[PDB]
Amino acid sequence: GPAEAGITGTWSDQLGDTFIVTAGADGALTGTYESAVGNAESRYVLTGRYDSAPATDGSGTALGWTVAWKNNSKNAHSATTWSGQYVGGADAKINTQWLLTSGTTNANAWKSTLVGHDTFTKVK
Amino acid sequence: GPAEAGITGTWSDQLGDTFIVTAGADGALTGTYESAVGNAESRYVLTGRYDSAPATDGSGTALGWTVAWKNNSKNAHSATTWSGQYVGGADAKINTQWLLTSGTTNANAWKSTLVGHDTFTKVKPSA
Amino acid sequence: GPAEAGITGTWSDQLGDTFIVTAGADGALTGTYESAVGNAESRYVLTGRYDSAPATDGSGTALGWTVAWKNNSKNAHSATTWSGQYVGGADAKINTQWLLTSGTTNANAWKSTLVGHDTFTKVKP
Amino acid sequence: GPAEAGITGTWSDQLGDTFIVTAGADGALTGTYESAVGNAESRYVLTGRYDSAPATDGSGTALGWTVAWKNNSKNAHSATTWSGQYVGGADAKINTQWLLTSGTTNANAWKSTLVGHDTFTKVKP
Ligand SMILES: O=C(O)CCCCCNC(=O)CCCC[C@H]1[C@H]2NC(=O)N[C@H]2C[S@@]1=O
Ligand SMILES: O=C(O)CCCCCNC(=O)CCCC[C@H]1[C@H]2NC(=O)N[C@H]2C[S@@]1=O
Numbered sequence: 001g002p003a004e005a006g007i008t009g010t011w012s013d014q015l016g017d018t019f020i021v022t023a024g025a026d027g028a029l030t031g032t033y034e035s036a037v038g039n040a041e042s043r044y045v046l047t048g049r050y051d052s053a054p055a056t057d058g059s060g061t062a063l064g065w066t067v068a069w070k071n072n073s074k075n076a077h078s079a080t081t082w083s084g085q086y087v088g089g090a091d092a093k094i095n096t097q098w099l100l101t102s103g104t105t106n107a108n109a110w111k112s113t114l115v116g117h118d119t120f121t122k123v124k
Numbered sequence: 125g126p127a128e129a130g131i132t133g134t135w136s137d138q139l140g141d142t143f144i145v146t147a148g149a150d151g152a153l154t155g156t157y158e159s160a161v162g163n164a165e166s167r168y169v170l171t172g173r174y175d176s177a178p179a180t181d182g183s184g185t186a187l188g189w190t191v192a193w194k195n196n197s198k199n200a201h202s203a204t205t206w207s208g209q210y211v212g213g214a215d216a217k218i219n220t221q222w223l224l225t226s227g228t229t230n231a232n233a234w235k236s237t238l239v240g241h242d243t244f245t246k247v248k249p250s251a
Numbered sequence: 252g253p254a255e256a257g258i259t260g261t262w263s264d265q266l267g268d269t270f271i272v273t274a275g276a277d278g279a280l281t282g283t284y285e286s287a288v289g290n291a292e293s294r295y296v297l298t299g300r301y302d303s304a305p306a307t308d309g310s311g312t313a314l315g316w317t318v319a320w321k322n323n324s325k326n327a328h329s330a331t332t333w334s335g336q337y338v339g340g341a342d343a344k345i346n347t348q349w350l351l352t353s354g355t356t357n358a359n360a361w362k363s364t365l366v367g368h369d370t371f372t373k374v375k376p
Numbered sequence: 377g378p379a380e381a382g383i384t385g386t387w388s389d390q391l392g393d394t395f396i397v398t399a400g401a402d403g404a405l406t407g408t409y410e411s412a413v414g415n416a417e418s419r420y421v422l423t424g425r426y427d428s429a430p431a432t433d434g435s436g437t438a439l440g441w442t443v444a445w446k447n448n449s450k451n452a453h454s455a456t457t458w459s460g461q462y463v464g465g466a467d468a469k470i471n472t473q474w475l476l477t478s479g480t481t482n483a484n485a486w487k488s489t490l491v492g493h494d495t496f497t498k499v500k501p
């Protein structure tokens with residue numbers, strides 16, 4: 001359907017953070033994420049979920065995903081989740097907010113979690 | 125290792141929101157989630173990731189997961205993500221913040237995303 | 252100083268949400284805020300704080316402010332705070348994230364708080 | 377009214393973070409905040425707003441405040457805002473979420489803002 005065909009593909013933000021994702025199986029997001037910033041290099045596994053039967057009446061399609069920042073080259077002892085929605089059109093977008101939590105001692109737990117926003121445009 | 129054995133099991137918060145998760149395969153989380161609140165009934169697929177080789181000296185283990193609020197009988201047109209960390213011990217905890225986004229019109233996108241906090245405690249074998 | 256002169260003035264985001272602010276007295280923000288969206292009409296009181304001695308290493312100036320959405324026209328039983336930083340130069344910006352909490356019963360407290368992001372540019376005049 | 381009497385006083389969280397606030401003037405919060413954690417020493421100025429005519433259906437009272445982490449002792453080049461609600465009664469609480477932004481260069485702006493929660497209990501009228 002349109003949610004599957006819309007989300008599936010490659011997405012990039014203004015900083016060149018890029019992900020490749022497949023949307024299907026009635027709600028699964030799978031793919032890989034590459035950050036252009038922070039303690040990260042090369043690709044990280046992405047897993048998430050999306051609404052596979054969205055309100056078709058001008059609303060976006062809700063979705064989210066997770067990346068743990070460990071791969072074969074690096075481990076940043078952190079994970080990020082993005083929560084947002086897919087909007088179609090010529091300039092299709094995934095508009096999100098994100099939360100990045102680092103593993104901490106209990107003393108530093110109050111400062112464990114960064115928050116931000118990320119808008120992705122579809123590249124292929 | 126300890127992150128896999130610590131995280132895997134059954135977890136619930138002060139409201140009775142509960143999940144069952146398995147941590148393995150070098151950083152995968154899979155399970156089911158049940159909310160006691162909101163436009164939700166019964167169980168929903170959970171998928172996420174965790175740090176499979178956490179810092180060695182008393183830090184928490186970073187993890188996150190996602191639930192889209194559609195299952196076999198309900199669809200709330202929304203998805204939540206939880207980002208947080210695991211800590212072990214007898215009162216093991218997963219301490220998180222969450223973001224819940226609804227599909228909206230572009231005019232209403234400014235009000236699409238709720239935010240909150242959720243501390244889960246692991247059900248012990250002694251239960 | 253630079254931070255007082257830079258923050259002081261009229262600011263608007265892409266949606267036409269607008270505020271007018273004065274920065275002074277070693278850290279005080281005072282002004283009015285007008286929202287183009289939501290359960291809001293006319294101008295609301297804004298109060299906040301800023302770092303009146305910011306780093307001079309190229310960093311922005313931290314700041315934050317609060318609006319309770321009650322005025323003489325409307326009461327939306329809610330309040331928003333913005334947390335962010337000011338950056339000067341010809342494309343001066345205040346880049347923020349915000350938290351909007353509504354008064355709720357305990358049963359609805361779990362869904363009391365919205366989050367978003369807001370970038371403001373300086374208006375003349 | 378009960379919002380003013382309710383919110384005015386001394387509050388603390390589980391970590392010992394404490395603020396002393398006066399609520400009045402049809403929606404003003406004024407006082408000082410002391411953190412027990414982080415790059416903070418002694419008392420900082422607090423300014424905020426609250427809903428001075430809240431719903432009477434059992435709902436909490438929306439509120440928000442800001443602290444810039446500059447005082448006569450220290451400057452941490454950052455500001456925090458708390459958005460939340462006051463719930464009255466015999467276990468009077470202020471339940472909030474917060475956003476802490478540091479001034480940063482543009483290279484570091486992506487990591488400028490921390491997020492958390494804070495529940496406060498009233499320790500003194
Ligand atoms: O990064 C530091 O050196 C200190 C802050 C602690 C964070 C540790 N983890 C990381 O740096 C992993 C990479 C995070 C990248 C973030 C950025 N890139 C994107 O594509 N979007 C944003 C959000 S994601 O969390
Ligand atoms: O309640 C309404 O109908 C208005 C809010 C619109 C959101 C629609 N989505 C839902 O209600 C799905 C359920 C969300 C449950 C939330 C709550 N339960 C938990 O276990 N933790 C929190 C976060 S989760 O997002």
Ligand SMILES: O=C(O)CCCCCNC(=O)CCCC[C@H]1[C@H]2NC(=O)N[C@H]2C[S@@]1=O
Nearest residue numbers: 268286288289290291320327329331349351
């Ligand atoms: O989801 C629902 O049906 C209830 C939403 C509850 C929010 C009630 N409060 C309001 O509508 C007051 C106005 C909020 C305006 C928000 C928007 N305008 C801006 O300039 N920036 C954003 C953040 S501000 O909180």
Ligand SMILES: O=C(O)CCCCCNC(=O)CCCC[C@H]1[C@H]2NC(=O)N[C@H]2C[S@@]1=O
Nearest residue numbers: 111393411413414415416445452454456476
């Ligand atoms: O890496 C680090 O050292 C932390 C990031 C830089 C933050 C600098 N600012 C500060 O440390 C000022 C103090 C923040 C205190 C926070 C804590 N205390 C409370 O009462 N509640 C929380 C939120 S508040 O922002």
